[PDB]
Structures are given as structure tokens and as C-alpha cells.
Amino acid sequence: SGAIYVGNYRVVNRHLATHNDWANLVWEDSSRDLLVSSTTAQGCDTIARCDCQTGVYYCSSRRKHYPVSFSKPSLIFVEASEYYPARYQSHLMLAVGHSEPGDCGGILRCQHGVVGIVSTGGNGLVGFADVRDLLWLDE
Numbered sequence: 228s229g230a231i232y233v234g235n236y237r238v239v240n241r242h243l244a245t246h247n248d249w250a251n252l253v254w255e256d257s258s259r260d261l262l263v264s265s266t267t268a269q270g271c272d273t274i275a276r277c278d279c280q281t282g283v284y285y286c287s288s289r290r291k292h293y294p295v296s297f298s299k300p301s302l303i304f305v306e307a308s309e310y311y312p313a314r315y316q317s318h319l320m321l322a323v324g325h326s327e328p329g330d331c332g333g334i335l336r337c338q339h340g341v342v343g344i345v346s347t348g349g350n351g352l353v354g355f356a357d358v359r360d361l362l363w364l365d366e
């Protein structure tokens with residue numbers, strides 16, 4: 228579980244969005260596993276605006292923050308889960324690291340701010356949904 232809170236926006240994994248998020252929907256992309264909903268209070272997370280490939284992610288299944296190298300956002304074939312069939316997930320970055328379903332929403336951060344959230348995993352890899360291209364989160 229987990230979310231990014233920036234301005235009057237809440238960024239969550241689409242497969243973990245609640246009743247309240249869908250009713251106050253701003254934007255959603257199934258292929259990215261992202262959903263943004265409006266909020267009444269202002270958030271304090273800063274979104275990174277960079278092309279960093281090193282950062283630190285939070286892994287709740289280990290209660291630990293791990294430093295990782297990650298690939299640039301791409302279109303990657305992801306195996307079927309209970310939430311989506313087997314498909315090409317877009318704007319996805321991979322790192323060698325531990326992750327379990329319940330780790331989705333864990334933040335990946337660089338020196339410039341929030342890079343993305345845990346969205347996929349398996350075979351000793353963790354996948355993060357990039358949010359650095361969503362420039363409208365800043366305004």
C-alpha cells in the first residue's frame with residue numbers, strides 16, 4: 228500500500244484505488260497501473276523532474292529502504308496477476324530487488340524527489356510506475 232500526495236492530487240496504484248478515488252477521479256491509465264484523484268488538503272511530496280537511474284525504494288515486506296539502479300521508463304511485458312491479465316505495461320522501470328504484492332505503492336526516490344511507486348515484481352526484480360513525465364502534477 229501507499230500513495231504520493233502532491234498539491235491537490237493523490238497518486239495511487241490503479242489496482243488499489245478506493246471508492247472515494249474513483250468518485251474524485253482526475254486521470255487514470257490501466258496500461259500504467261496509475262490513478263490520480265483530487266484531495267481537499269495540500270500535499271507535500273515533490274515530484275522529481277530528471278532522468279536519474281539511481282534511487283532508494285521502500286520495501287514494506289522487509290521494513291527496509293534499499294538503494295537501487297533502475298532502467299529508464301519503457302513498455303514491458305508483465306505476467307498475469309489477480310488485477311490484470313498478461314500485458315504490456317507502459318512507463319515502467321525495473322530494478323534488481325525484493326518485492327511482494329503488498330509492497331505496491333512503496334515510493335522510489337532520487338535526490339530530485341519522488342520518481343515513482345512499486346507496481347510489479349517477480350523473479351527477484353521490482354517494477355516501478357514512473358510519475359516524472361506527469362508535469363501537470365506540479366500545477
Ligand SMILES: C#C[C@H](NCCc1cocn1)c1nn(C)c2ccccc12
Nearest residue numbers: 305308309311326327328346347348349
Ligand atoms: C499481483 C501483483 C502485484 N502487481 C499488481 C499490479 C500489476 C499486475 O501486472 C502489472 N501490474 C505485484 N506487485 N509486486 C511488487 C509483486 C511482486 C511479486 C508478485 C506480484 C507482485
Ligand SMILES: [Zn+2]
Nearest residue numbers: 277279337339
Ligand atoms: Zn533525479
